[PDB]
Amino acid sequence: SNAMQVKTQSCVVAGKKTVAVTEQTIDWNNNGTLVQITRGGICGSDLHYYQEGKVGNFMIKAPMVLGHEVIGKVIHSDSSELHEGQTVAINPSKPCGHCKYCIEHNENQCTDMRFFGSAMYFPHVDGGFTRYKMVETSQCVPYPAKADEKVMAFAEPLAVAIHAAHQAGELQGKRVFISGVGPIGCLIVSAVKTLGAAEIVCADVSPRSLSLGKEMGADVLVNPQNDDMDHWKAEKGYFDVSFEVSGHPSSVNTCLEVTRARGVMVQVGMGGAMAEFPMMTLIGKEISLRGSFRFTSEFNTAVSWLANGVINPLPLLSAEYPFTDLEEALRFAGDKTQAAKVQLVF
Amino acid sequence: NAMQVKTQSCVVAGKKTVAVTEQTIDWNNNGTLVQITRGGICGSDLHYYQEGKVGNFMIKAPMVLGHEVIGKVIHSDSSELHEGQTVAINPSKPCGHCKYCIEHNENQCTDMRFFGSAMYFPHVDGGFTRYKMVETSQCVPYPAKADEKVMAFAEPLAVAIHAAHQAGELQGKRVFISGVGPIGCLIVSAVKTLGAAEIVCADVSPRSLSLGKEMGADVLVNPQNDDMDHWKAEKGYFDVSFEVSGHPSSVNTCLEVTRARGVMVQVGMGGAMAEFPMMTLIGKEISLRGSFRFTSEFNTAVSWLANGVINPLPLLSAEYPFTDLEEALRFAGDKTQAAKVQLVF
Ligand SMILES: [Zn+2]
Ligand SMILES: [Zn+2]
């Protein structure tokens, strides 16, 4: 437990298409929890930092560690409940405890938020793609070591999906439409299935994303290019709830035409500012458009769902790459034709 | 007592083409025959005369205008409606068998008939007529002691109450109302009665802001002259925001001013809104709800006006006889001089 300076190799981005694993140094001192990272997933936030060196308007001004969905083992902890060698999933959220949104238990909307691998503030918060990382004790969520290492790495994306399902309101016995079955969309499929949806219909252009959608629990699969949607759009819509995850303006219109009047449409996917929104369709049908952003307490639920085998995300795991060949993994994850979820092994 | 009686109607046939015509109905003792005594000019009637279309619905055949009218019962097939009874005419006639009507969402009725709406073919005739035969369920009685000028606000108040109910819980909340026209002012009075703790309205015209103060608004705001930084700090200030004007800049201010996970009720229609900041709605998780017409709040609006829950007379700008139809529509389209204009029959 003695205060020591441990070494680590961190996945670091410096700019647009500038990426390298560098030497680093953290000085541990009996405050917080020292965690050896074992596995981490590549999200869309990480690809944007490598492809364009930015997310939305947030640019990278100094080198930063990537990754925000990360699991590992405990090495040292200031809490006696967290034993050494314990398998934990790292919650990338570290909010303050005194702002108005965190007081109301809406920690996902914290004013002084510090998310893993987020270039929102400067200096940016370093991510989890590193061999050793010192983290807060409350950010360590234990799980039984018998759980599959490859399954638990889906803790953060599942939390994003579970939170998106709760933004829909009542789901028991409802008819759910899920436009865009990427990694997040497929986890929303299994989320609404577990939460009691009576019929899940999902749509995507690539049949590969549809093939993954049926394996995650979908009942009907539609391709907007080929199949016709007119019987879904009949009598002011058919579905109680719609999930827009692709972020494409074409898919947003269909969700409005497909959702019944006074229905709920959960906006998950982000694709800039939509440039021609049918606001008249929203007013006429009284649709309840609700946004979804990250998660609050659904991270502990996702760790429980994955450990107890409620859902099985392994069909989404496309490939594994050692953390030393990091750029090759970023190039492979950006290819949407072959990679759904790519994990880094530490 | 079958009878044929003549009537005068306020008919539009195209853009700017407006005339008062003579018509003849055939009252065969089914429904209820009423003499319309007073009617209010709404934004739909102006859009039909200013450009011949509401949104994307053009006027193809001549149509009677108006959907905010009151009157007295001439004859009725029900013994409960005594002749001469003052009534407010509900412009909605929903079916009783569709999906949304069974679930008590008749404002979203698949087979809906609304006064003076070009959404259907043939268009449903409006209420701007000296005599009109209507369904008995569309007649809502009110005590004859009530003011005729006050009860004419029944339809726009019913729209405001329905919009306030889209907000969810309003007791002790901080509401922001962007666009404080006639509908916006009635929303000010609605959430005030429903228990809003603080009402802040915003508009460019100082005349409309002066009307909002009399309707119960706590703080008045001109969005260009006043600094709105205080209400945008910490990802927003107000629990609920009411977008009523329809301008994109007003939509943007409501998104920045509403706190995260707040409610934004969209009332004003202003075309397929372009350059919509969807990223702001995602990051803050604002619940954007739409409000369309009304359902059961029409009976509530008639009861509010008959018992003086809210007095809408500060919104009445001018009274015109229905003979000077095109004179009133020209005066109603002038926002500098008019808020709500009434036609008397
Ligand atoms: Zn906070
Ligand atoms: Zn119906």
Side-chain angles (χ1 to χ4, degrees), chain A residues 1-80 82-169 171-275 277-335 337-346, chain B residues 1-79 81-168 170-345:
Chain A
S1 80
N2 56 89
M4 93 214 84
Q5 172 207 73
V6 331
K7 316 293 184 179
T8 183
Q9 311 172 221
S10 307
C11 296
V12 174
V13 54
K16 173 176 174 293
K17 233 91 172 189
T18 298
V19 152
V21 165
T22 83
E23 68 160 33
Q24 213 151 88
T25 285
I26 72 180
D27 305 0
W28 150 263
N29 183 19
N30 209 344
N31 251 338
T33 302
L34 183 54
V35 167
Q36 166 163 15
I37 305 314
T38 63
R39 185 172 293 266
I42 308 176
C43 178
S45 161
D46 305 308
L47 291 181
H48 281 353
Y49 285 145
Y50 166 73
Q51 290 176 346
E52 301 299 323
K54 76 195 182 70
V55 54
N57 271 30
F58 304 155
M59 268 177 50
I60 170 155
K61 302 184 289 185
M64 186 196 64
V65 182
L66 288 172
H68 55 75
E69 35 189 274
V70 147
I71 64 177
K73 325 175 305 178
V74 183
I75 292 188
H76 295 308
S77 183
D78 58 353
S79 173
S80 297
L82 264 188
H83 295 12
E84 291 184 337
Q86 175 70 237
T87 51
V88 290
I90 309 300
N91 191 335
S93 292
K94 179 223 161 73
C96 72
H98 45 83
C99 87
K100 62 167 168 182
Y101 298 111
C102 293
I103 285 176
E104 302 162 354
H105 303 328
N106 293 318
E107 285 94 358
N108 64 332
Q109 297 287 344
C110 176
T111 53
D112 201 356
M113 180 56 204
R114 280 140 65 88
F115 203 81
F116 274 1
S118 177
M120 177 179 173
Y121 309 92
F122 196 74
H124 325 295
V125 190
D126 285 325
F129 282 171
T130 174
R131 203 152 208 164
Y132 302 90
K133 199 220 192 317
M134 189 159 55
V135 83
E136 294 289 304
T137 317
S138 46
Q139 299 184 268
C140 296
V141 183
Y143 67 91
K146 41 196 152 301
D148 191 356
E149 190 189 76
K150 312 167 186 177
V151 165
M152 303 302 301
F154 290 82
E156 198 271 356
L158 183 59
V160 175
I162 297 179
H163 178 83
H166 288 312
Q167 302 309 291
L171 288 181
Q172 174 61 42
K174 301 291 190 173
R175 293 156 207 181
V176 176
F177 179 75
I178 300 182
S179 182
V181 273
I184 298 297
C186 289
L187 295 176
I188 297 178
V189 168
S190 54
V192 300
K193 156 63 63 182
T194 302
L195 290 172
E199 183 183 15
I200 318 171
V201 181
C202 58
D204 204 318
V205 282
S206 65
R208 171 153 160 79
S209 299
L210 290 180
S211 174
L212 303 173
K214 167 143 279 297
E215 186 142 19
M216 302 311 297
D219 293 307
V220 185
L221 318 108
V222 188
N223 194 317
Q225 292 174 357
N226 323 311
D227 310 12
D228 185 50
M229 291 268 211
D230 288 358
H231 71 289
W232 308 117
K233 305 180 183 185
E235 50 190 14
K236 296 203 189 184
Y238 168 85
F239 293 88
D240 294 301
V241 185
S242 56
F243 285 88
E244 211 304 277
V245 201
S246 60
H248 299 325
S250 165
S251 170
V252 179
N253 283 254
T254 293
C255 290
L256 292 170
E257 311 167 48
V258 114
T259 312
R260 62 186 286 153
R262 299 190 128 271
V264 181
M265 169 176 155
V266 172
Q267 177 66 23
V268 178
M270 327 173 191
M274 241 228 54
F277 193 56
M279 176 57 71
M280 304 190 262
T281 313
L282 175 62
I283 305 171
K285 305 178 62 178
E286 291 179 308
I287 304 297
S288 195
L289 174 63
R290 303 166 185 178
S292 189
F293 176 76
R294 285 179 181 169
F295 49 86
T296 160
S297 57
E298 299 83 351
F299 185 86
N300 296 333
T301 307
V303 174
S304 185
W305 280 18
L306 296 174
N308 300 325
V310 174
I311 72 142
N312 176 35
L314 279 173
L316 303 192
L317 178 52
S318 295
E320 312 183 35
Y321 277 102
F323 86 101
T324 59
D325 303 324
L326 162 70
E327 167 149 22
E328 177 179 2
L330 287 174
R331 284 194 171 105
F332 186 80
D335 198 323
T337 320
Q338 42 182 337
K341 210 51 180 165
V342 184
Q343 292 174 352
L344 298 181
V345 177
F346 291 80
Chain B
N1 197 342
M3 180 174 52
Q4 340 86 351
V5 285
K6 315 279 165 265
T7 183
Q8 321 259 311
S9 301
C10 294
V11 179
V12 57
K15 174 177 166 296
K16 308 289 262 303
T17 298
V18 152
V20 43
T21 72
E22 282 97 62
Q23 287 187 299
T24 286
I25 52 96
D26 262 306
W27 147 262
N28 198 22
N29 275 95
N30 75 308
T32 296
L33 185 63
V34 300
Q35 168 175 4
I36 304 302
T37 72
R38 185 168 297 275
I41 301 177
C42 182
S44 71
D45 307 309
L46 289 176
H47 285 332
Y48 284 142
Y49 157 75
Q50 289 180 1
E51 273 220 68
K53 32 147 281 185
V54 162
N56 274 323
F57 297 97
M58 295 224 313
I59 166 178
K60 310 171 182 178
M63 182 196 65
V64 177
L65 287 165
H67 56 81
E68 321 175 345
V69 292
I70 66 178
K72 305 182 175 189
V73 178
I74 303 295
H75 292 296
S76 181
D77 63 338
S78 165
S79 68
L81 277 176
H82 300 322
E83 295 175 0
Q85 174 87 229
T86 50
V87 290
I89 311 299
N90 193 323
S92 300
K93 191 219 171 177
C95 74
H97 51 79
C98 89
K99 182 176 56 181
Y100 307 101
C101 280
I102 292 301
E103 301 177 358
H104 307 327
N105 297 323
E106 20 265 333
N107 72 325
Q108 298 286 348
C109 176
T110 295
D111 194 3
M112 161 60 75
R113 305 249 157 79
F114 203 84
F115 282 172
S117 179
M119 289 162 46
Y120 326 105
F121 190 82
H123 308 305
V124 186
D125 280 333
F128 286 169
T129 167
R130 200 174 257 172
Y131 300 92
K132 188 182 191 62
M133 182 166 42
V134 83
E135 298 286 297
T136 304
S137 62
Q138 304 183 253
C139 298
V140 184
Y142 67 91
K145 175 261 160 189
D147 195 339
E148 215 180 60
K149 303 166 298 163
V150 172
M151 301 309 300
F153 288 81
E155 197 275 351
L157 173 60
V159 173
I161 301 180
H162 183 63
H165 281 297
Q166 304 311 288
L170 287 165
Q171 179 63 223
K173 259 53 181 298
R174 301 158 156 172
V175 289
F176 177 71
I177 298 172
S178 186
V180 64
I183 295 300
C185 284
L186 296 176
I187 293 178
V188 173
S189 150
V191 298
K192 171 90 162 188
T193 312
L194 295 177
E198 183 184 8
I199 307 146
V200 175
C201 66
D203 196 358
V204 196
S205 176
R207 168 89 201 282
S208 296
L209 285 180
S210 180
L211 295 175
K213 176 92 79 177
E214 183 150 43
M215 296 289 92
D218 286 304
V219 185
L220 318 180
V221 164
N222 195 287
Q224 192 198 48
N225 312 330
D226 303 358
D227 182 22
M228 313 204 67
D229 280 351
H230 163 51
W231 293 301
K232 300 185 183 188
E234 300 298 81
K235 286 211 245 272
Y237 174 84
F238 292 82
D239 305 302
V240 184
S241 64
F242 288 89
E243 163 61 28
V244 198
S245 64
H247 309 298
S249 60
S250 175
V251 169
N252 298 322
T253 53
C254 292
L255 285 172
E256 294 175 329
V257 154
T258 306
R259 49 174 268 155
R261 304 194 64 85
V263 182
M264 177 176 174
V265 178
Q266 180 71 35
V267 180
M269 315 168 184
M273 193 268 186
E275 227 172 7
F276 174 73
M278 180 155 277
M279 198 70 54
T280 305
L281 193 148
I282 300 173
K284 306 171 59 176
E285 307 180 300
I286 301 125
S287 187
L288 178 52
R289 297 154 181 175
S291 176
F292 183 69
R293 293 178 179 171
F294 51 87
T295 300
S296 59
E297 303 87 332
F298 188 88
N299 303 336
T300 304
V302 174
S303 189
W304 274 21
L305 297 167
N307 292 115
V309 178
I310 136 257
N311 192 262
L313 287 184
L315 298 177
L316 197 156
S317 300
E319 261 179 83
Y320 280 103
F322 86 99
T323 294
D324 321 324
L325 176 56
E326 201 177 354
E327 171 91 59
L329 297 168
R330 287 186 167 102
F331 186 81
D334 184 15
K335 299 297 171 296
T336 69
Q337 278 189 115
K340 212 69 173 66
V341 181
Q342 293 186 352
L343 297 176
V344 65
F345 294 75

